[PDB]
Amino acid sequence: SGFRKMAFPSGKVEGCMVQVTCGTTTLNGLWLDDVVYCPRHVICNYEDLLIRKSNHNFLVQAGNVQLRVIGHSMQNCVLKLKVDTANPKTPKYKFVRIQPGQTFSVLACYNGSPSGVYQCAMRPNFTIKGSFLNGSCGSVGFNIDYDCVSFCYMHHMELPTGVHAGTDLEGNFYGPFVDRQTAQAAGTDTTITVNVLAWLYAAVINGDRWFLNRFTTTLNDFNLVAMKYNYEPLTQDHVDILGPLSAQTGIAVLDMCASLKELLQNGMNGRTILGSALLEDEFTPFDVVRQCSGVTF
Amino acid sequence: SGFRKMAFPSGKVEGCMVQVTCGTTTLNGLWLDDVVYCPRHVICTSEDMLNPNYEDLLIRKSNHNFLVQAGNVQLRVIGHSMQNCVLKLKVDTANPKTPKYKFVRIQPGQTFSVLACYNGSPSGVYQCAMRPNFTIKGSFLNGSCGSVGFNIDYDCVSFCYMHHMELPTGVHAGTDLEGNFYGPFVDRQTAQAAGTDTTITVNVLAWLYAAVINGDRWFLNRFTTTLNDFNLVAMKYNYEPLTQDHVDILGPLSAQTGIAVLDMCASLKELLQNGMNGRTILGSALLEDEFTPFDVVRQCSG
Ligand SMILES: C[C@@]1(C(=O)Nc2cncc3ccccc23)C(=O)Nc2ccc(Cl)cc21
Ligand SMILES: [Cl-]
């Protein structure tokens, strides 16, 4: 029993974190093979700023050992520093771009030194509600699938509302954001409906059935209610994805949708679901199956 | 900005997790130097669980009965001793990935990260607090025994918990790494219940200071309270008595925000009386009690 916001073990990623210094700016780098990936704003027209830099201007540090930079290129908003030493601790990895609603683990780092690990979700507005201070830039988001680390996020900036914006590891931002000091705002956020439903199934699995009802709804009627409560549209793909949880608990997806419709119109009424007074939307249907079945890495 | 339930990076601990098999029972072990620490109930046969005599069960076991596995490599057990409710298996190989470590016993209200493992393989990491009733509200399935709780302050890993059992309410009970249980619990299948839980008042106040630091002041008020009057109200909501030690511990947060501890205590009393009124504090509709005053300073400043 128990349901917790659980991150993937960060060990495979810790072995990659390095400190990248360029002039006054100090942030984190991801050292994979002989390349160190970091936000391109470490140099701060990035093509013009980078052409003025030499390899010895980038001081890379892995523990107490300094890596010597032998090349530098830019791929969208990420700087790829070619180094002389290939990281022996480089895990099996892939660079994946995640979709909003998908969750990942963030290894927050300051001065190439991992300080904490937390779970979060790519919000529908392409921001993440992270926990970052100055020096956290270059901190990465990842998932582990068997023995392979899928890098999906690299932290770049904090928006004025306290939410965070970053890129995939190919330097492509999530959202309509740019990497410079300018007026940028996080768009109106929405709740990840498929994730709330997954968390309601986890609650059922954990012996919390008060919110269940004899009712079931149509996908059209659920989406009409969901749009009114700033909830993401639930697709037939989402219903199919919730299939295993629906099978395991005995509550059809549209039965749990009638439960969510009642929770949205009526509220929790002094009650909690999995120790929460709010509808949690940062557990995907896969996170619920992984935690309520015990998959290992 | 941002406030998250943040666990310590688990890497230093992952390198220690091993699978301990003794007969039918398979659980996790913590391999530090040439010793593998695991719950002593690994020697029990379920029908030797209501009233196990571990000294009698262990005297019957030999070193080759304990199959220890670190990855695909099998460790050879060369000795075995028992220290309270933990089994210490002396192995022939010292773990090269052994970090700088200490065994620390924690007090209720203290938090720690848990690296949940199954078959000596880490599956997840989460942040926990030792509840005032000495249980933890973990996320554990069968086969998670031996999973450890830790804090990684500086470069040293302080091991504070080893998972042993799940109580009938779904909460978990375990020991420090010296095998001493937290709480009035025993490693027996006998009827054991978690005592009435309470809210860690010092941690709620710390989380309210984190909220002030993050620009959330809606809950603040023009009132102060005596410490006695705060506890009289707090006790009625099942909140732990706030001691002068707790007030002293909150001193730095009070200094940083400019809100005296007893004024933050008046805000808390008001939140207990009124609730949130559709509002949230740091994305929560409930008063969070699993962030110590130290966790708040670490996450908000360094
Ligand atoms: C092995 C066991 C235990 O609580 N294990 C578990 C530990 N943690 C989580 C579990 C979730 C589901 C099932 C079993 C879980 C048990 O089933 N009875 C019993 C009695 C005494 C002790 Cl010290 C240990 C146990
Ligand atoms: Cl303590």
- Counting every residue written for chain B, the total comes to 302
> Exposure pattern of A201-210 as b/e (b: 16+ CB <10 Å)?
bbbbbbebee
The closest of B195, B192, B148 to B166, measured between CA atoms, is: B192
Single-letter residue type at B195 = G
Structure tokens, B233: 């109200």
Structure tokens, A49: 């700023």
B187: which DSSP letter?
S
Q: What is the separation of C-alpha A72 from the centre of its chain, rounded to a whole number of angstroms?
A: 27
**What is the domain-level CATH number for residue A24?**
2.40.10.10
Structure tokens, A114: 């991992």
Tell whether B5 and B95 lie within a shared domain: no
Tell whether B109 and B7 lie within a shared domain: yes
Backbone angles phi, psi at A247, to 5 degrees: -65, -45
Q: Which residue has the tokens 């008060």?
A: A210
Please tell me the distance from the alpha carbon of residue B182 to that of residue B279, in angstroms, as a whole number: 36
Instruction: Supply the angle between the helices B201-213 and B261-274 in degrees, to the nearest 10.
Output: 100
Q: What angle do CA A162, A163, A165 make, to 5 degrees?
A: 130
Strand partners, B83: B86
Give the torsion sign (CA, A145, A151, A152, A157).
Answer: positive
Residue that finishes a domain, picked among B173, B197, B221: B197
Pairing of strands B35-39, B66-70: unpaired
Total number of domains constituting chain B: 3
The full DSSP string for chain A is ------BPP-HHHHTTEEEEEETTEEEEEEEETTEEEEEGGGG--HHHHHHT--GGGEEEEETTEEEPEEEEEEETTEEEEEESS--TT--EEEE-PPPTT-EEEEEEEETTEEEEEEEEE--TTS-B-----TT-TT-EEEEEETTEEEEEEEEEEE-TTS-EEEE-TTSPBSSS--SSSS---PPPP-B-HHHHHHHHHHHHHTT--TT--S----HHHHHHHHHHTTBPPPPHHHHHHTHHHHHHHT--HHHHHHHHHHHHHH--TT--BTTBSS------HHHHHHHHHT---
Q: What is the separation of C-alpha A147 from the centre of its chain, rounded to a whole number of angstroms?
A: 19
Tell whether A181 and A234 lie within a shared domain: no
The closest of A150, A75, A93, B123 to A141, measured between CA atoms, is: A150
Query: Which residues numbered 258-287 in B keep a CB inside 8 Å of some CB on A?
Result: 276, 280, 283-286
Q: How was this structure determined?
A: X-ray
Q: What angle do CA B15, B19, B24 make, to 5 degrees?
A: 175
Strand partners, B28: B19
Q: Burial of A234 by CB count in 10 Å (0-12 exposed, 13-18 middle, 19+ buried)?
A: buried
Contacts of residue A108, defined as CB under 8 A and 6 or more positions apart, other chains included, come to A114, A115, A116, A117, A118, A130, A131, A132, A136, A139, B6
**What is the domain-level CATH number for residue B234?**
1.10.1840.10
Tell whether B123 and B262 lie within a shared domain: no
Residue that finishes a domain, picked among B69, B99, B129: B99
The closest of B203, B151, B159, B162 to B185, measured between CA atoms, is: B162
Tell whether A112 and A256 lie within a shared domain: no
Q: Burial of B84 by CB count in 10 Å (0-12 exposed, 13-18 middle, 19+ buried)?
A: middle
Tell whether B69 and B130 lie within a shared domain: no
Q: Is B62 helix (H, G, I), strand (E, B) or coil?
A: coil
Closest residue in B to A276 (Cα) is: B286
Active-site annotation holds for B145: yes
Please tell me the distance from the alpha carbon of residue A166 to that of residue A108, in angstroms, as a whole number: 13
Residues of A whose CB is below 8 A from B5: 5, 118
Say if ligand 1 is within 6 A of residue B41 CB.
yes
Tell whether A148 and A164 lie within a shared domain: yes
The closest of B147, B113, B109 to B127, measured between CA atoms, is: B113
Put simply, the answer to whether A117 touches B166 (Cβ < 8 Å) is: no
Please tell me the distance from the alpha carbon of residue A10 to that of residue B150, in angstroms, as a whole number: 14
Say if ligand 1 is within 6 A of residue B40 CB.
no
Tell whether B1 and B104 lie within a shared domain: yes
- Report the C-alpha dihedral over residues A118, B103, B105, B148, rounded to 10 degrees: 40
Tell whether B68 and B124 lie within a shared domain: no
Tell whether B80 and B132 lie within a shared domain: no
Active-site annotation holds for B246: no
Residue that finishes a domain, picked among A157, A172, A189: A189
Structure tokens, B151: 């804090």
> Exposure pattern of A72-101 as b/e (b: 16+ CB <10 Å)?
beeeebbbbbebeeebeebbebeebbbebb
Strand partners, A106: A118, A141
- Supply the range of the domain harboring residue A52: 15-91
Contacts of residue B153, defined as CB under 8 A and 6 or more positions apart, other chains included, come to none
Tell whether B124 and B230 lie within a shared domain: no
